[PDB]
From Swiss-Prot, chain B:
InterPro entries cross-referenced by the UniProt entry: HMG_CoA_synt_C_dom, HMG_CoA_synth_N, Thiolase-like
Protein's name according to its UniProt entry: Polyketide biosynthesis 3-hydroxy-3-methylglutaryl-ACP synthase PksG
Source organism of this protein record: Bacillus subtilis (strain 168)
Keywords, comma-separated and alphabetical: Antibiotic biosynthesis, Cytoplasm, Transferase
GO annotation, biological process: acetyl-CoA metabolic process; antibiotic biosynthetic process
Active-site positions on this chain: E81 (proton donor/acceptor), C113 (acyl-thioester intermediate), H237 (proton donor/acceptor)
Gene Ontology CC annotations of this record: cytoplasm
Gene transcribed to yield this protein: pksG
Disulphide bonds in the chain: none
Pathway: Antibiotic biosynthesis; bacillaene biosynthesis
Catalytic activity annotation: 3-oxobutanoyl-[ACP] + acetyl-[ACP] + H2O = (3S)-hydroxy-3-methylglutaryl-[ACP] + holo-[ACP] + H(+)
């Protein structure tokens, strides 16, 4: 009847980043498909990241197409308020039409997929024919073995009725959730709990989501049905591990062919995760976007996506991306934008770390210095970017910088 | 395919106090209270939280379902601004203690008091999408107020659970009949763990702006819609009855453009029913509109199917106006939950008991890592009423919450 999914998607992978191994030295042989991690500056927040992710999408839309954006869901665990959604600020600085539902969803790293699935149902519901939605997953890590791994990033996803970049397979969904005692975020500016069960639950969910998908999609098969696979990816290493486990557990193939399957179906999805680090609720979208830019779509290919969030909830779902989709995605130049970011030295990193306190969950009044790390602003010369200028009686003021 | 509320129930606290009594005991200007239609406010005990409230709201709904119907619950959204964690959703704990099937999406939505409606509208679209035919969803709006001065007597605690599905006798929504409107505004927000801040200076102006613009958007999509004749009752986000009375008046002048003399009558026949339960509970934030909807259905007249119009607002802000039909059968279903009876059975705090509670509310405070709760800290309350089993917070251990059923 009516199709639904991603019409466009873009990644904002920070203004600044550091070299993961360098930071380990300055602080052995883990070395686990990490290379770079993005780092939120103090004049940056989840609004900044979300707006900067979504701006290139909105820029490319006509005035009429933009006014059809009628749902803006931001997905995060880096909330700035217990009641005010990040979506309010984002709605303002992207200049969206007021005829728009806006809110924030939260379930650890499942947030993005939850937001996306609700957006998809808005489209399929046809409660507003021709409408679009914008789902923005945005997370940052402020502040031992988590520090070099923990990133900052956002992925914006425009959803609608002509989804050349990722047309979902309606109803082809295996969702699974249950309460588990796991690493959570019970304190304002930090984490707590235990990643001791994390992997076990991720793998449990990974299996059970696919089995639920098979139950609703008869004939589905983990090896042949999917030409690429994308996973919630905190770091490449554990996804490589989880893929291996899936091929033994579920696909039940011989050990010798697994490395090949990983390289052809999963490695493309992992490219951008190495440039940015764990971006939590945006990690799966990042991997999806990596998959689409780094893979091959001479003809339409099916991609299977697994989403997981601690606590926990999870979902496995799938969609088609076409040659035209991949073309659209290339115009955003994600890789080029990653190449242009500013590399912190360890000394600069220390100035940032000691400065991150001035913007800390309770902060009522603060004025930010964009020159606090002198080189960064006037360093690249690109499209305008949003930054946090000040907090005044808890209300946030943002500024465009060219 | 139809969609909407198949059942709905309210949990209005274990304990409550008399609002005027609390104003006196705090030595406040009684005048600033006198026309606001407030009587009682519910108060979360320290052994209660948004999970407790949510679970207790939803339990009777789940009890009334067959095993098979319950296993079709595939979406659990909880709607709050009283979150307990930056990433772990209240839905995880609620999913556990209601015993739902693991084949279920779960998460939390947040936009001030719009949270509930946002959750409910996403749930409706799950049903209309037919991505899982026969599936149901459960949307639970749950908020509590822990502890500026003039908010204390007004600020309540409560939850409303809403089962959404394909045979909605209690509120069948009108698909696409939706006027949503939002924009950024500097308003009263919740930027600190256990409190509020900002300014209710623009709040009313924005609530009224939104109330008008949502209906105009609704008209734009529903040609022929009319604020007076189309809706046999109207429900609003209601923090307290007084401002909804005011906002209805304003709407009848601004939008319906009727003569001043007939407005009081229109308020009494179309709005006053919806305000009954709010007086018993106080402002329950994201659940307030659902509370008023439930009040409307229990207290109104549905000899024949009536259309109800609902206005949802949340500071910051976002808002939506939408409508549905409720049938005589719907109102019957709703009566089986005995909401009024449950409100009658709550424990009334004295001011001395209220002080013990207030000084105790600190031990359960957003950052709390380890605590053991005393259910006898206010001696009379537990073994007071004799009702179905109820969930309470027993302990927090390394940030993980443990809950207990008490018969």
């Amino acid at each position: 009847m009516v199709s639904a999914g991603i019409e466009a998607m873009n990644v904002f992978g920070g203004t600044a980043y550091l070299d993961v191994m360098e930071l380990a030295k300055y602080r052995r042989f883990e070395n686990l498909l990490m290379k770079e991690k993005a780092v939120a500056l103090p004049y940056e927040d989840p609004v900044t990241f979300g707006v900067n992710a979504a701006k290139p999408i909105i820029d490319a839309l006509s005035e009429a197409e933009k006014d059809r954006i009628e749902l803006l869901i931001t997905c995060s665990e880096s909330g700035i308020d217990f009641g005010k959604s990040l979506s309010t600020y984002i709605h303002e600085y992207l200049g969206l039409n007021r005829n728009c539902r806006l809110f924030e969803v939260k379930q650890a790293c499942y947030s993005g997929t939850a937001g996306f699935q609700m957006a998809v149902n808005f489209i399929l519901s046809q409660t507003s024919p021709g409408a679009k939605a914008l789902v923005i997953a945005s997370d940052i890590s402020r502040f031992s073995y988590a520090e070099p791994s923990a990133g900052a990033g956002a992925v914006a996803v425009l959803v609608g009725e002509n989804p050349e970049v990722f047309q979902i397979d309606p109803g082809a969904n295996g969702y699974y959730g249950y309460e588990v005692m796991d690493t959570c975020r019970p304190i304002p500016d930090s984490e707590a709990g235990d990643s001791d069960l994390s992997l076990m639950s991720y793998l449990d969910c990974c299996e059970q989501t696919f089995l639920e998908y098979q139950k609703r999609v008869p004939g589905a098969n983990y090896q042949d049905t999917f030409q690429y696979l994308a996973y919630h990816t905190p770091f490449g290493g554990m996804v490589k591990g989880a893929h291996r486990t899936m091929m033994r557990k579920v696909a039940k193939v011989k050990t010798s062919g697994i490395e090949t399957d990983f390289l052809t179906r999963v490695k493309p999805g992992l490219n951008y995760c190495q440039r940015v680090g764990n971006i939590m609720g945006a990690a799966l979208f990042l991997a999806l976007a990596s998959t689409i830019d780094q893979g091959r779509f001479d003809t339409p290919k099916r991609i299977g996506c697994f989403s997981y969030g601690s606590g926990c909830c999870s979902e496995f779902y799938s969609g088609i991306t076409t040659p035209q989709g991949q073309e659209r995605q290339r115009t955003f130049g994600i890789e080029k934008h990653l190449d242009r970011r500013y590399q912190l030295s360890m000394e600069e990193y220390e100035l940032l770390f000691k400065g991150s306190g001035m913007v800390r969950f309770g902060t009522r009044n603060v004025k930010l210095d964009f020159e606090m790390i002198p080189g960064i602003m006037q360093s690249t010369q690109e499209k305008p970017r949003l930054f946090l200028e000040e907090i005044s009686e808890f209300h946030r003021k943002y500024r465009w910088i060219s």
